Amino acid sequence: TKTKIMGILNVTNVESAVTRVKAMMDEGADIIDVGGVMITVEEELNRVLPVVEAIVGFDVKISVDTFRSEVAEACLKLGVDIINDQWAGLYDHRMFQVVAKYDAEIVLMHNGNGNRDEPVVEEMLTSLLAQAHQAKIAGIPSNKIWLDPGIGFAKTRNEEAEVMARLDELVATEYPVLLATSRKRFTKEMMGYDTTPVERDEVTAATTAYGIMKGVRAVRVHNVELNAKLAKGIDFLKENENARHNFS
Amino acid sequence: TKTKIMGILNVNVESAVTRVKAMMDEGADIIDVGGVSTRPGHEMITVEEELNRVLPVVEAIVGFDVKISVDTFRSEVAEACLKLGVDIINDQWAGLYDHRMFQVVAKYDAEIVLMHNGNGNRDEPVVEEMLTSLLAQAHQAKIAGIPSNKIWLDPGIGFAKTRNEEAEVMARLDELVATEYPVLLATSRKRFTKEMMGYDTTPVERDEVTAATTAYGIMKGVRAVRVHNVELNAKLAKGIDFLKENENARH
Ligand SMILES: Nc1nc2ncc(COP(=O)(O)OP(=O)(O)O)nc2c(=O)[nH]1
Ligand SMILES: [K+]
Ligand SMILES: [K+]
Ligand SMILES: [Mn+2]
Ligand SMILES: [Mn+2]
Ligand SMILES: [Mn+2]
Incomplete structure (x- = not known):
């Protein structure tokens, strides 16, 4: 019934991260979104992993902002709850399998196709719903998929203004919507x-x-x-x- | 047109000027100056004490490039202020305390905020009682000479209402807005x-x-x-x- 507050934790010390996480939990964070990503899968894991190991035991949901199944899978074995995928599984189709496999949630952020034919809202809906379908046919439940309009990605000033005046239509798809x-x-x-x-x-x-x-x-x-x-x-x-x- | 920001200035004079400057810098369109309260159980003061508290502050800030409103329910304090160039009179009694208020306000071509107050022991629903009251007062403000687009309505959250009644009002702010008088939420x-x-x-x-x-x-x-x-x-x-x-x- 309540609006979730996803806190941002960029990992570009584990100690300071830990202290910051408790500070965020304290300020009201429901989900801690950890993210540290062009670098190598191995480099991304070198930054994100040590943090996830330290904070995943805490009593808060951990989202991980990644778009490569390898980073998402090591994180999910540690007990992570969400994979915030900026590519909505477009970058690595195997994200859907990794997530289905760990009974986790996934965010599908609208991205790419910057020089789109169709108006931005019809395109965003078409792409996001298409990605949702892929998520499900991988075995991920309907109710574990979030949609994100992706403010700041592949959209002109005018396109985002359009998107922000019509959030109701994204909400209307009945998937839970994360605004970012x-x-x-x-x-x-x-x-x-x-x-x-x-x-x-x-x-x-x-x-x-x-x-x-x-x-x-x-x-x-x-x-x-x-x-x-x-x-x-x-x-x-x-x-x-x-x-x-x-x-x- | 934008939503106006009326900053609260509760009333020494230099201390007050300092705080007005800051409010202007933070984005204030109006500075609302008051020295009184209509809360039963609160200190009551004389017209004269209100003046000593209020007049020296208004005098020192009326020149600034910001509108000045004065939170008073007595027309003697109101006029003293309108004579210094004040723009708005904010009335906790919507002119029911002093019936010369609308005439004083319209005389200096000012604006007036009519706040819902009183009759805490009503037996009809808060909302219709507030509307009936505020619109009757407004109708009286116009008779006296204040144009409608210069008569503000304020639901008086925090005055003569039960928690039950405040929640009723907050859930129906649009009905007050629907009256077409500009609306101030406080x-x-x-x-x-x-x-x-x-x-x-x-x-x-x-x-x-x-x-x-x-x-x-x-x-x-x-x-x-x-x-x-x-x-x-x-x-x-x-x-x-x-x-x-x-x-x-x-x-
Ligand atoms: N128009 C209007 N005027 C008001 N003046 C004083 C207070 C409350 O007075 P007090 O409790 O002394 O606190 P403060 O002066 O800081 O608002 N509330 C309103 C209000 O709701 N509407
Ligand atoms: K946890
Ligand atoms: K002024
Ligand atoms: Mn619409
Ligand atoms: Mn006050
Ligand atoms: Mn309604």
Whole structure:
């Protein structure tokens, strides 16, 4: 019933990572998204693995931002819960098998096809739904697949503005939607100037509120506390609204 | 047009000017100055004490490039302020405390915020009682000479209402917005935001849930928000206005 808060942990110390994870859990993170990725599968594993081994025992879900089944599989043997795939299984078809094999969840982020024929929304829907079908025919449950519009990838300024004005249509596919705009160019431009990254937390929080109201079920963010608490408030307001209107 | 940010200035004079400057920098469109409260159980003061507290501050900030609103329910304090060039009179009694208010406000061509207050022992639903009351007062503000597009309605979250009644109102902000008078939401760090937190915090820690009420309220159509943390809310309001314009522009 509650909006999930996926915290961002970029791994580009294991000790500092661990301390940061507890700090994030503390600020309200439901999922800790670890990511460290052109480098070698081996190099990617050299950065991501030591962290995953240290934090996977904690009482929080661990997502791993990777697009290669080899990185996803070593992580899943350690007990990881989600594979946040920026390519939506396009980069390595074997991602679907690795995930099915460990009864995990997977995020399918819209990416590629930058010079698309069709308008961005029809294309994103077509591609993402096509990837969802592949996930399932691999044996991954329907309810373990998330869709991500992929703000910041293979889309022009105009295309993303279109995508952000029609989030309801992605939500309408009934798959749980993860919004991930945090501190991106799109948020930089909401501010209207060349802001530094951190300066983008408040507009990012705006996307969270707006997205939750459009039906997004999770938000991927750098500033956990701000979004965790802004989301709590918005969730509260919608529920209160349903209650007082006897809407369900 | 954007959502206006009315910063709260609770009332020495230099200390106040400092805080007004900062609020302007954080994005404040209006600075709302008050020295009184209409909460039963709170200190009551004289018109004269309100003046000593309020007038020297208004005098020193009315020149700035920001609108000034004065939170008062007595027209003598109002006029004293309108004579210094103040732009808005924020009335916790919607002109029911002092019946000369609308005439004073319209005399200096100002704006007025009519806040829902009183009759906490009503037996009809809060919402229809508030609408009936606020619209009757508004109708009276126009008779006196205040144009409709300068009469604001405020649901008075935190005044003469039960937790049950505040939740009723927050779930139906659009009905107030539907009246077509510009709407000001003022929930900052109040008890309602404390329920949202679901626990006890110092006032400052209620800022994020206050900001959620801002995002939500803008979605519902309110035109301004009265807040303590101007920056968090000004920056948030800005993102929401953009998301909303973008969505309307694209449809
Ligand atoms: N128009 C309007 N004016 C108001 N003035 C004072 C308070 C609450 O007063 P207090 O409890 O003293 O706190 P603060 O002055 O910080 O808001 N609330 C409103 C309000 O909801 N709407
Ligand atoms: K875990
Ligand atoms: K001024
Ligand atoms: Mn639409
Ligand atoms: Mn006050
Ligand atoms: Mn309704």
